[PDB]
Amino acid sequence: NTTSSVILTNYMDTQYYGEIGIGTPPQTFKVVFDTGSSNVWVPSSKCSRLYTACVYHKLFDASDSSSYKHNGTELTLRYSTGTVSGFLSQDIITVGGITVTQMFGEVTEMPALPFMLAEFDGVVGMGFIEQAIGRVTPIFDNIISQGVLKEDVFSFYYNRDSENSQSLGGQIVLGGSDPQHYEGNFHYINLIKTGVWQIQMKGVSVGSTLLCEDGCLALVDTGASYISGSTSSIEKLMEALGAKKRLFDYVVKCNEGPTLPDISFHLGGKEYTLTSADYVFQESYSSKKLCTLAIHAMDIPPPTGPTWALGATFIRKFYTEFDRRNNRIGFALAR
Ligand SMILES: CC(C)CN(C(=O)c1cnc(C(C)(C)C)nc1NCc1ccco1)[C@H]1CCCNC1
Numbered sequence: 466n467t468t469s470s471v472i473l474t475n476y477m478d479t480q481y482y483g484e485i486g487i488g489t490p491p492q493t494f495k496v497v498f499d500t501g502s503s504n505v506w507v508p509s510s511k512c513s514r515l516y517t518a519c520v521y522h523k524l525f526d527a528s529d530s531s532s533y534k535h536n537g538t539e540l541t542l543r544y545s546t547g548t549v550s551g552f553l554s555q556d557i558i559t560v561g562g563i564t565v566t567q568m569f570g571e572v573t574e575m576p577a578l579p580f581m582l583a584e585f586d587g588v589v590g591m592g593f594i595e596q597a598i599g600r601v602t603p604i605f606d607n608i609i610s611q612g613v614l615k616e617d618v619f620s621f622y623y624n625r626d627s628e629n630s631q632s633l634g635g636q637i638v639l640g641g642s643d644p645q646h647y648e649g650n651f652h653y654i655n656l657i658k659t660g661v662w663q664i665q666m667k668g669v670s671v672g673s674t675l676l677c678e679d680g681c682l683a684l685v686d687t688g689a690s691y692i693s694g695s696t697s698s699i700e701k702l703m704e705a706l707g708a709k710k711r712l713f714d715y716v717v718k719c720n721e722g723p724t725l726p727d728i729s730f731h732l733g734g735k736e737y738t739l740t741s742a743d744y745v746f747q748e749s750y751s752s753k754k755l756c757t758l759a760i761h762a763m764d765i766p767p768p769t770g771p772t773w774a775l776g777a778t779f780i781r782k783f784y785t786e787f788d789r790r791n792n793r794i795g796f797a798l799a800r
Pocket residue numbers: 479480481482497499500501502544545546579580581582583584588686687688689690691776777
């Protein structure tokens with residue numbers, strides 16, 4: 466019956482990661498704790514240096530760990546934004562002072578796009594075994610097995626401040642939540658199914674409901690930067706906002722930013738509202754300058770998709786508790 470936290474760094478409101486240690490002695494890695502996937506991977510020393518992303522990130526060297534256990538089963542992790550490929554290994558992983566023996570992917574194939582843009586080295590998947598490639602037991606499942614934690618829950622706080630380096634970029638409590646980072650009560654929404662951190666959504670509103678009328682899906686994805694929907698969902702949301710489409714993002718003229726309407730997500734009977742301040746990167750107030758929106762198109766395939774994904778844009782405003790004992794997600798106002 467103990468509780469434990471991981472200190473997160475916030476890079477520019479788009480990348481949130483903490484530090485883990487792998488092996489004896491610990492090799493440390495910057496990792497995204499991702500509720501939208503279920504595998505652990507770091508880049509590997511076996512990764513060809515022709516992968517520039519492998520030049521620019523910390524590499525796990527199995528030859529420097531005395532606690533490593535070979536497996537070498539190939540794995541390929543297909544994310545919506547890009548793919549990593551490699552092989553399975555087993556070592557001791559430390560995460561918030563919790564030591565666990567864990568199967569993880571040693572990534573030998575790490576595309577320059579998008580991975581050169583990653584501040585983090587790898588990913589710690591916080592999803593279920595059902596979504597785990599290779600049917601590899603996820604790290605939290607392993608920590609639960611130990612019987613150390615007070616509750617079968619984990620919580621995410623993502624800070625709104627990335628500039629002020631003398632502040633906490635984010636936090637993950639394993640085994641509970643932290644009351645210093647939320648307020649009011651938790652609102653609990655049960656999952657559609659076990660296997661995925663996905664909840665029923667019954668509306669996306671601009672200002673009047675104009676999307677997700679007959680119901681749709683919402684993946685709560687701590688590993689994502691943005692709120693995402695389907696290409697057609699986003700194109701209709703953006704037409705409503707007067708946002709011009711670009712190659713990788715949507716933008717308004719910076720001056721139009723504060724005048725943008727509130728966007729609401731109807732989740733578990735409550736209306737979860739984001740103001741323009743919650744979703745516009747107000748980098749300027751100029752009419753000559755384009756400001757990027759924290760909402761993009763992301764088409765996730767079956768069986769998970771098509772689905773909306775509530776990423777860091779959403780978690781910033783809403784402190785999120787992931788409840789594995791009751792298969793539900795709690796949202797409270799962050800502070
Ligand atoms: C690799 C993994 C994190 C990929 N995903 C991303 O959204 C993602 C993609 N590419 C980037 C790059 C490299 C471009 C920086 N960053 C990402 N996320 C940063 C972040 C950390 C905290 C919150 O958001 C999703 C994929 C679907 C399952 N959930 C995660």
